Design a protein around this ligand. Structure first.
Ligand SMILES: O=c1ccn([C@@H]2O[C@H](COP(=O)(O)OP(=O)(O)O)[C@@H](O)[C@H]2O)c(=O)[nH]1
Ligand SMILES: [Mg+2]
Lengths: 124, 106, 527
C-alpha cells in the first residue's frame, strides 16, 4: 500500500483557549513506528514540538511545550492526538505530522513520509 | 542541544558543487539527518544517519561526517534542486532542527 | 572502551592455582594407585567421594538460587536488546514457533531488534525468508539476499539494513554456523547494548529477556549470562527423556554452582546474552581461532564464553529465564551431538587452561576433576572386569547402580517432583555409548563437519558404530574371560557356597530393580 498521513483540527482559536489536532495514518500501524509533531511558524524554520511511541509509553516534549501540551495515540483508531492548552500568540504555525522508525544507537532513519500541514491561528 | 547551519544562504548556478555544513554541540549518541523543503511544500527526507541516503533520491546528494561537523554535498546543481535544506539532530527526549541554507539561482 | 580486567598480581595467583591443580591431580592419582595396589571398600570410598562432591555442588547451587530469588530490583526499560537467530535447514514448525516466541517477547518494541541469518542463498532457502516476512509483516522489516559472506557491494546494504531497521532478514552463502553468527555480530556494530543469541529451534518465554536484562544490569562486572533452556519434545523417544533429565540437572546444579562463584564455564547457545561492547571487542579474535586439536579452525558459544572469561568479565546464570529447544531422538544423532560437544570441550580445555587466575579456584577444580574423571572410571571398569571373578563384576555393576540411585534420590530431594527417579537409567547410556564416544572425539579432534544435518533431509552418518563395537567387544571379552576363570575355580567350600548364595541374591536384587525401573518408566510414559 501507500503510506499517507492526514492532519485535521486546525483553525482560529482565541488566546488562552484549548485546541485539538488529529493525525490519521494509512498504510501502516501507529504502534509500530514513531509519531512526531513539527511546527513551522510563518517566516521561520521547522521546530520540534512533541513525540510519542505507542505500545511503549515513551513521550517527549520541547522545553517550551512541557506543562502545556499533551500527546496521545489510538492504535484502534490509528490516530495521533495532540491537545494544546493555555494557547499564546507565538503558537501560530503550520503543524506537521511525521513518521519515523526507532532510535537504537547512533542510527535513526530520519523523518520519512512527511504529512501535510494544518494551520493554527491564535489571535484576538 | 545547539545546532548551527553555517551558510544560512547560498547562490550557485546550474552545475556548481554545493556544500552545506552543520555544527552540533554534541553528537555522541544522536543521529543527523538532512531534509529538503520547497516553498509551500512539506519537507522530504534526503540523508539519514549522516552517511546513508534515502531510496529514490538522485545519487548526487552525499553526506559526510567529520568530528562534530556534518556535511551535505551536491555535485551538480540541477534546475529542480533549488529549495531550503534543513539539518536535524535526532535523539530520545530531545530533537533539534536547523535553519536557513536556502539554495537560490544566481 | 571496556578495559581488559586482570588480577592485581600475576605469577602470584597463576602459580598458586597451577600448583593447586597439580597437587589435586597428584593426590587423586596417588589415592587411586594406593587403592589399586593395596573390592567393596574401595568402591565405597569412590562413592563417598562422589557423594561429597555432589553435596558441595548442591549446597552451592541452593545458596545461589536462594540469593537470586531473595534479591529483586525493578528494571528500567532503557537498554536495547538485539536477538540474533541463525537458520540452516530448520523445520517450518520449529522456525514458526521460534518466530512467534520472539515476536511475543514481553519487552518494549522500541528497545528490541530481531535479526535472522539464513545459511544459504539458493532457491531451497527462500521459504525461511518467506515465513520471516509473513510474521513481521506490520513492522519495519528489511530483507536481503547476499551473494556471499564477509570472507568471500552487499556489505554496505547489509550493514545499513541491520543498523537502520528493527526486523532484519539476511540470506548468505553457505559457511556454517560460524559465518552466520559472525555476519550478525559484525552487522550489529554499536546499535544495541545487549546481544542475545538464539537458535532457530528455540521457543523463548516472555520474561526470559526481562530477567536476563535484570541480572545483567545489577553489576557492571558481568559480561555474559545464560538461561535455563529446556526440551520442547521430551516424549519423542526414550533418549529425549534422558536428555531432558540431564539438561535439568546441568542447568540447575552445575550452572547454578558456577554462577555462585561467577565462573559459568559455558553459556547455552539457544539462551544466552552478552554485552555488545565486549562482543565487538573479541569478535575478530573469536572468528580467527585455531591451534585446537592441531590447526583446525573453531568457534562457537563455548568459545564465546571462554573469550568473555579471558577478558576478565564474569558470566552469570539466572533460573528465571526459560526456553525450550529440541534434542535428537535417534540414538546415532544423539551420539553425534555428544561427540561434537566433547570435541568442542576438549578443544576449549587447552585455551581455558590459562585465565584461571582471574575467576576463583572452583573453575580450576571443576576443570581438572572433569578432565580426569572419565579416564579413572574407564581404568576402574577395565580392572574390575579383568579381575576374573563373577563376584567382582556383580558388585561393580551393583555399585554403579547404587551410586546412580543415590544421585537420583538427592535430585528428587532438590527438585521436589519425584519424576527425577528415572535418571538412574543414565548409567546404561553413559557406560555403553558415551565413553567410547568421548574416546572417538578425543582421537579425531582434527576432523570437523558438524555431524548432524538440518531438519529437512534427515540423513545417516552411522560412523559412531565403530567405537560402540570396540567397547562392546572389549566388555564381552572381559566378561567371558572372567566367567571362564571363575567356572574353572574351586567350589564346594563353605566360603564359595556363601559367595554363590550372595551373588545369586545380588543378581536377583539387580534384576528386580531393573524391572521395577522399567515398569515405572512404562507406566509414566503410558499414563
Ligand atoms: O551448518 C550449520 C548447522 C547448524 N546451523 C544452525 O545453528 C543452530 C544450532 O544447530 P544444531 O541444532 O545442530 O545445534 P544443537 O542444538 O543440535 O546443539 C541451529 O539454528 C542450526 O540451524 C547453522 O547455521 N549451520
Ligand atoms: Mg537445538
Amino acid at each position: 500500500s501507500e503510506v499517507q498521513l492526514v492532519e485535521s483540527g486546525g483553525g482560529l482559536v482565541q488566546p488562552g483557549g484549548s485546541l485539538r489536532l488529529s493525525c490519521a495514518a494509512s498504510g501502516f500501524n501507529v504502534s509500530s513506528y514513531y509519531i512526531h509533531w513539527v511546527r513551522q511558524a510563518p517566516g521561520k524554520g521547522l521546530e520540534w514540538v512533541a513525540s510519542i511511541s505507542s505500545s511503549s509509553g515513551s513521550t517527549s516534549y520541547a522545553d517550551s511545550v512541557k506543562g502545556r501540551f499533551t500527546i496521545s495515540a489510538d492504535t484502534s483508531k490509528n490516530t495521533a492526538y495532540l491537545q494544546m492548552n493555555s494557547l499564546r500568540a507565538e503558537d501560530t504555525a503550520v503543524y506537521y505530522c511525521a513518521r519515523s522508525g526507532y532510535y537504537w544507537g547512533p542510527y535513526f532513519g530520519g523523518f520519512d513520509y512527511w504529512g501535510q500541514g494544518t494551520l493554527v491561528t491564535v489571535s484576538s | 542541544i545547539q545546532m548551527t547551519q553555517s551558510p544560512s544562504s547560498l547562490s550557485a548556478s546550474v552545475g556548481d558543487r554545493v556544500t552545506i555544513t552543520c555544527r552540533a554541540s554534541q553528537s555522541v549518541s544522536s543521529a543527523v539527518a538532512w531534509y529538503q523543503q520547497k516553498p509551500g511544500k512539506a519537507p522530504k527526507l534526503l540523508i539519514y544517519s549522516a552517511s546513508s541516503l534515502y531510496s529514490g533520491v538522485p545519487s548526487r546528494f552525499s553526506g559526510s561526517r567529520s568530528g562534530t561537523d556534518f556535511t551535505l554535498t551536491i555535485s551538480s546543481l540541477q534546475p529542480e534542486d533549488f529549495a531550503t535544506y534543513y539539518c536535524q539532530q535526532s535523539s530520545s527526549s530531545l530533537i533539534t532542527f536547523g535553519q536557513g541554507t536556502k539554495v537560490e539561482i544566481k | 572502551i571496556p578495559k581488559d580486567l586482570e588480577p592485581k598480581h600475576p605469577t602470584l595467583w597463576r602459580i598458586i592455582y597451577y600448583s593447586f591443580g597439580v597437587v589435586l591431580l597428584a593426590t587423586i592419582t596417588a589415592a587411586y594407585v594406593a587403592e589399586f595396589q593395596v573390592i567393596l571398600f574401595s568402591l565405597g570410598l569412590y562413592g563417598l567421594a562422589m557423594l561429597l562432591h555432589l553435596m558441595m555442588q548442591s549446597l552451592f547451587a541452593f545458596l545461589e538460587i536462594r540469593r537470586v530469588n531473595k534479591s529483586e530490583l525493578p528494571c528500567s526499560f532503557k537498554k536495547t536488546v538485539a536477538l540474533t537467530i541463525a537458520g540452516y535447514q530448520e523445520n517450518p514448525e520449529y522456525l514458526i514457533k521460534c518466530l512467534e516466541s520472539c515476536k511475543y517477547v514481553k519487552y518494549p518494541k522500541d528497545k528490541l531488534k530481531i535479526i535472522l541469518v539464513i545459511d544459504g542463498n539458493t532457491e531451497d532457502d527462500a521459504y525461511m525468508m518467506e515465513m520471516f516476512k509473513d510474521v513481521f509483516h506490520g513492522e519495519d522489516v528489511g530483507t536481503y539476499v547476499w551473494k556471499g559472506n564477509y570472507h568471500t557491494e552487499g556489505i554496505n546494504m547489509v550493514e545499513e539494513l541491520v543498523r537502520n531497521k528493527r526486523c532484519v532478514c539476511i540470506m548468505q552463502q553457505w559457511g556454517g554456523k560460524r559465518e552466520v553468527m559472525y555476519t550478525a555480530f559484525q552487522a550489529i556494530g554499536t546499535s544495541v547494548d545487549y546481544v542475545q543469541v538464539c537458535d532457530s529451534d528455540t521457543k523463548l518465554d516472555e520474561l526470559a529477556t526481562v530477567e536476563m536484562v535484570k541480572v545483567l544490569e545489577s553489576n557492571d562486572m558481568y559480561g555474559a549470562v545464560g538461561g535455563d533452556v529446556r526440551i520442547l519434545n521430551p516424549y519423542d523417544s526414550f533418549i529425549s527423556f534422558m536428555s531432558s533429565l540431564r539438561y535439568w540437572m546441568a542447568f540447575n546444579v552445575e550452572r547454578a554452582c558456577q554462577s555462585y562463584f561467577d565462573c559459568v564455564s559455558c553459556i547455552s547457545g539457544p539462551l544466552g546474552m552478552y554485552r555488545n561492547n565486549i562482543l565487538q571487542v573479541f569478535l575478530e579474535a573469536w572468528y580467527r581461532q585455531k591451534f585446537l586439536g592441531t590447526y583446525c579452525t573453531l568457534g562457537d558459544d563455548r568459545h564465546l564464553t571462554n573469550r568473555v572469561l579471558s577478558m576478565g568479565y564474569r558470566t552469570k546464570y539466572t533460573h528465571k529465564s526459560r526456553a525450550f529447544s529440541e534434542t535428537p531422538s535417534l540414538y546415532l544423532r544423539w551420539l553425534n551431538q555428544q561427540t561434537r560437544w566433547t570435541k568442542s570441550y576438549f578443544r576449549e580445555w587447552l585455551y581455558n587452561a590459562q585465565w584461571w587466575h582471574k575467576h576463583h579456584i572452583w573453575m580450576t577444580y571443576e576443570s581438572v576433576v572433569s578432565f580426569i574423571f572419565p579416564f579413572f572410571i574407564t581404568a576402574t571398569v577395565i580392572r574390575l572386569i579383568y579381575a576374573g571373578t563373577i563376584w567382582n563384576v556383580v558388585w561393580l555393576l551393583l555399585c554403579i547402580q547404587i551410586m546412580s540411585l543415590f544421585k537420583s534420590i538427592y535430585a528428587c530431594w532438590l527438585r521436589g517432583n519425584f519424576i527425577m527417579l528415572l535418571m538412574s537409567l543414565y548409567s546404561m547410556l553413559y557406560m555403553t555409548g558415551l565413553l567410547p564416544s568421548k574416546y572417538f572425539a578425543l582421537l579425531t579432534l582434527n576432523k570437523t563437519g558438524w555431524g548432524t544435518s538440518g531438519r529437512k533431509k534427515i540423513v545417516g552418518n552411522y560412523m559412531p558404530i565403530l567405537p560402540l563395537s570396540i567397547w562392546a567387544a572389549v566388555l564381552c571379552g572381559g566378561v567371558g574371560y572372567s566367567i571362564y576363570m571363575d567356572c574353572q575355580n574351586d567350589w564346594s567350600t563353605p566360603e564359595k557356597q556363601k559367595e554363590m548364595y550372595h551373588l545369586l541374591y545380588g543378581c536377583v536384587g539387580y534384576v528386580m530393580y531393573w524391572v521395577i525401573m522399567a515398569v515405572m518408566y512404562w507406566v509414566w510414559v503410558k499414563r
